[model samples]
Target: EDMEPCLTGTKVKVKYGRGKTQKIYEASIKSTEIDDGEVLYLVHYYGWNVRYDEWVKADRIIWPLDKGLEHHHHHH
Candidate 1:
């Protein structure tokens, strides 16, 4: 808990689902929420069906070290 969890505009790699068949993806952190004492990361995921903003749990994936904002992070 040294740094803020899920700061807006973060470079990250994400994983969804479970087991060997889990989906690996990438996104920029757009926001965050604290639900039941857990940090939920709002990101612009690549595989979004309806919208770009999706909430992600930290237990699912990891991030890159301060890679700055991505290009696709703007209006799509």
Candidate 2:
């Protein structure tokens, strides 16, 4: 099946921190869900005068489930 782009332009909720330590004061995420292993998201934060952006390699993103593994493993 052909995959459709998943575009999202919503603000990221600041889940932690207060002053300068905050990585994202507020952000907008615009992305396409490419496949089971990939996505393309555009990120923008509040303090910057321009949008802080990039095409992220989704599989390289550290997820919550990846916290304590020493080796790579796959599960189905």
Candidate 3:
């Protein structure tokens, strides 16, 4: 079977947060299922999120990091 490039155990990003503050989250691809042409990625969000696990669409996240996840200084 021909699956997508990023399978389980692969590190990827899943979109999180909301509004203008929505951020791309780093996560491990826990699993994946493809139906028709839609790809559902099951991942574990390893960021500042409470919910560590969720399923997301293909375009719901940035694949293989296209220069994303740049850290910024947090002053609080």
Candidate 4:
């Protein structure tokens, strides 16, 4: 439970769908809401249709490690 919190624009890998067909997909946090004393996040799935943006519980969200693996700009 000692992981960084998910905030707006936080890049992550989310478990999409269910069963053996389910797979981890790249996504980003869009927004969050509090309903019935619970938290839900509106996540935007990268490289997918914007219409697929869905609100999910914290359990459905996953936080990648703090390693610098996805660096984009590395000029030397």
Q: Return the lDDT, model 1, position 62.
A: 80
How far residue 10's Cα lies from its native spot in candidate 4, in Å, is 0.7
Whole-model lDDT values for every prediction:
0.70, 0.44, 0.72, 0.75
- What is residue 48's positional error in candidate 4, in angstroms? 0.6
Summed over model 3, clashes come to: 0
TM-score of each: 0.59, 0.34, 0.56, 0.64
Using TM-score as the measure, the top candidate is 4
Q: Tens-digit lDDT track for model 1 on 1-76?
A: 4676556566578878757856778877877888889988877776664375667798765866445744565621
Deviation from native of the Cα of residue 10 in model 2, angstroms: 1.1
Winner on lDDT (1 vs 4): 4
Residue-by-residue lDDT tens digits, candidate 2, 1-76: 8554354544443333448644424544556445555564454444553654544444333333435644455321
lDDT of 1: 0.70
Each prediction's RMSD to truth: 7.9, 10.7, 7.8, 7.3
Clashing pairs in 4: none
Q: Write the residue-wise lDDT of candidate 4 on 1-76 in tens digits.
A: 5554557657677786767857777788987888789998888888885886977778888876545565555311
Greater-lDDT candidate between 2 and 4: 4
For candidate 1, give the lDDT of residue 38: 97
TM-score for model 3?
A: 0.56
Which portions of model 3 miss their true places by more than 4 Å?
1-6, 17-21, 35-37, 47-52, 65-76
